[PDB]
């Protein structure tokens, strides 16, 4: 599933990758 990173402008299709990706973005867990 297309997962757009509003911060980067990019987009994934894998939940874990984008989640861990936004985890770094958010600074949270
Ligand atoms: Zn990003």
From Swiss-Prot:
Tissue specificity note:
Expressed in germinal center B-cells.
Q: Where is the cross-link described as Glycyl lysine isopeptide (Lys-Gly) (interchain with G-Cter in ubiquitin)?
A: 10
Cystine crosslinks: none
Zinc finger region(s), C2H2-type: 3-25
**Where in the cell is the protein located?**
Nucleus
State the family named in the UniProt similarity comment for this chain. Answer: Belongs to the krueppel C2H2-type zinc-finger protein family.
Quaternary structure and interacting proteins, as annotated: Homooligomerizes (via the BTB/POZ domain), multimerization is required for DNA binding. Interacts (via the C-terminal zinc fingers) with GIF1; the interaction results in the recruitment of MYB to the CDKN1A/p21 and CDKN1B promoters and repression of transcription. Interacts with TRAF2, interfering with the binding of UBC13 to TRAF2, and inhibiting TRAF2 E3 ligase activity. Interacts with MYC (via the C-terminal helix-loop-helix motif); the interaction inhibits ZBTB17 transactivation and growth arrest activities and renders it insoluble in the nucleus.
| UniProt function note | Transcription factor that can function as an activator or repressor depending on its binding partners, and by targeting negative regulators of cell cycle progression. Plays a critical role in early lymphocyte development, where it is essential to prevent apoptosis in lymphoid precursors, allowing them to survive in response to IL7 and undergo proper lineage commitment. Has been shown to bind to the promoters of adenovirus major late protein and cyclin D1 and activate transcription. Required for early embryonic development during gastrulation.
Can you say what this protein is called? Answer: Zinc finger and BTB domain-containing protein 17
Q: Which gene encodes it?
A: ZBTB17
């Amino acid at each position: 599933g297309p997962l757009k990173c509003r911060e980067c402008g990019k987009q994934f299709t894998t939940s874990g990758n984008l989640k861990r990706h936004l985890r770094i973005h958010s600074g949270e867990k």
